[PDB]
């Protein structure tokens, strides 16, 4: 009726807390129950201490993975474009792309050439550029961020991109009025009972009634001059 557990393989009676037999290394049978009465001696309390420290050090190892892994995810917000770390194949090109020569879209995670994305941006009829990825399951509905678009385009094309965006909103509103100066970008929104729009670009005063610029005339003088100059 001893306190310890006898080893079924070698008959050595082991201390209750030991997981393996001190003689033959056999595991403590799972049926055995350790009495709470037992106090571990200097050898067992030392072994349990080393076990709790091994667990303590393993747990702080996993926390360093957690914090180390996370900082690399935050690392990639330091730049606008995210590049491929492995070789990638462009779903539009079919071109092979060495690491650092393809762009990973932030909203989609699909990887493309800089060249095809440039045509995809310049050919987008919507102010929000979609990812051109298409497979047999789905078209990707993710959008290229303006951060990524600015870094992908020449400054000329980036400015053309912004101009198309504001003109998309302008075409959408039937309450918009554009400056009648040629090639001028100025335009405004119709306020009720306002008949003159002084454009902030050309500084010419647009008459909203005639929807034209007649600064040296009034509306009737301009209208009769207009019909007189344009006959058939």
């Amino acid at each position: 009726e001893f306190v310890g557990w006898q080893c079924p393989g070698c008959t050595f009676i082991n201390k209750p807390t030991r997981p393996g037999c001190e003689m033959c290394c056999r595991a403590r049978p799972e049926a055995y129950q350790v009495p709470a009465s037992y106090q571990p001696d200097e050898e067992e309390r030392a072994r349990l201490a080393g076990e709790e420290e091994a667990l303590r050090q393993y747990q702080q190892r996993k926390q360093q993975q957690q914090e180390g892994n996370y900082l690399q995810h935050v690392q990639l917000d330091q730049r606008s474009l995210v590049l491929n770390t492995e070789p990638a194949e462009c779903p539009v090109c079919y071109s092979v792309l060495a690491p650092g020569e393809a762009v990973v879209l932030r909203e989609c995670l699909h990887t493309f050439c800089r060249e095809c994305l440039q045509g995809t941006i310049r050919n987008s009829q919507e102010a929000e550029v979609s990812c051109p990825f298409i497979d047999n399951t789905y078209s990707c509905s993710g959008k290229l961020l303006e951060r990524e678009i600015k870094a992908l385009l020449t400054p000329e094309d980036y400015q053309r991109f912004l101009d198309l965006g504001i003109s998309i909103a302008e075409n959408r509103s039937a309450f918009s009025y554009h400056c009648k100066t040629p090639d001028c970008k100025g335009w405004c929104f119709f306020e009720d009972d306002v008949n003159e729009f002084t454009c902030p670009v050309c500084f010419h005063v647009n008459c909203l009634l005639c929807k034209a610029i007649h600064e040296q005339m009034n509306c009737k003088e301009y209208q009769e001059d207009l019909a007189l100059r344009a006959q058939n």
Binding site: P19, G20, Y58, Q72, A127, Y138, S141, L162, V194
Partner: protein, 305 residues
């Protein structure tokens, strides 16, 4: 003279002719005579305890037809304990000169685990196959951890922005908030800023894998949003560009109030355009996905009075 029995771990019964005056060394030399085992590798167990070399069968009160139990132990060997994440503890006989390679082979012999699937950790550091236990200062009754390569089970894969592909272990009952927490456990990414995408579908936390019909070996995409201080550009028709400091939770009303502070234009005279759309005062910057370094266009209503 009397006869006693020695039982081995292999299951053999050995008979010896002995005397009470024989020491335990003498009994071990008799076993060496018959079985060829070095005496300083032998351990003899009687009455559940190990017999010391200097004493006699008479001192331990070993009589005729007594049965001794033989255990073999390397004279310069020691025991170490390898702990699994399952809670099981494996007890190994090792030597300080044994390599991590050898320890893996010992774990395979005892537990049937291939060395392919064995990662051993001592004092927080993973052990390399060519180095020895003494190299890592692994001493008698030290405690190591064993992490197995896989469970099989159900796995899914999560590719990330950094190119690192993650492998997760889940069950079909698993809430996506759960899978977001398991990504948080492995990568530290808070779950509130995770966007898990399968086949172009944004996955919502309440629903689970089976309800999105996502089976094992699937590959998902992890997109991360962020709530933090950002800088946006508001651009007039003149090309004037001011830089604003905002948060994604900011309203369009909030942004127009910032423009009023910087340029003196009242919000009722302000119309903001982004992505070919006029921005509604009630909605937020997150609602329009207005992210970092975005350009909002500013068109002023027409003054009159």
């Amino acid at each position: 003279s009397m006869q006693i029995f020695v039982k081995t771990l292999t299951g053999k019964t050995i008979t010896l002719e002995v005397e009470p005056s024989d020491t335990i060394e003498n009994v071990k030399a008799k076993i060496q005579d018959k079985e060829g085992i070095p005496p300083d590798q032998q351990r003899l167990i009687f009455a559940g305890k190990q017999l010391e070399d200097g004493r006699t069968l008479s001192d331990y009160n070993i009589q005729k037809e007594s049965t001794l139990h033989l255990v073999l132990r390397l004279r310069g060997g020691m025991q170490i304990f390898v702990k699994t994440l399952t809670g099981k503890t494996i007890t190994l006989e090792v030597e300080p000169s044994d390599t991590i390679e050898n320890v893996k082979a010992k774990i395979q012999d005892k537990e049937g685990i291939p060395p392919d699937q064995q990662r051993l950790i001592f004092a927080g550091k993973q052990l390399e196959d060519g180095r020895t236990l003494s190299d890592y200062n692994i001493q008698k009754e030290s405690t190591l951890h064993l992490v197995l390569r896989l469970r099989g089970g159900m796995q899914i894969f999560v590719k990330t922005l950094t190119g690192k592909t993650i492998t997760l272990e889940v069950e079909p009952s698993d809430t996506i908030e759960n899978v977001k927490a398991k990504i948080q456990d492995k990568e530290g990414i808070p779950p509130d800023q995770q966007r898990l995408i399968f086949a172009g579908k944004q996955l919502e936390d309440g629903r689970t894998l089976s309800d999105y019909n996502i089976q094992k070996e699937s590959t998902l995409h992890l997109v991360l949003r962020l709530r933090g201080g950002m800088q946006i550009f508001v651009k007039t028709l003149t090309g004037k560009t001011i830089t604003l400091e905002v948060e994604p939770s900011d309203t369009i009303e909030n942004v127009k109030a910032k423009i009023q502070d910087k340029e003196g234009i009242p919000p009722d005279q302000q119309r903001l355009i982004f992505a070919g759309k006029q921005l509604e005062d009630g909605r937020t910057l997150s609602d329009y996905n207005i992210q970092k370094e975005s350009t909002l266009h500013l068109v002023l209503r027409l003054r009159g009075g």
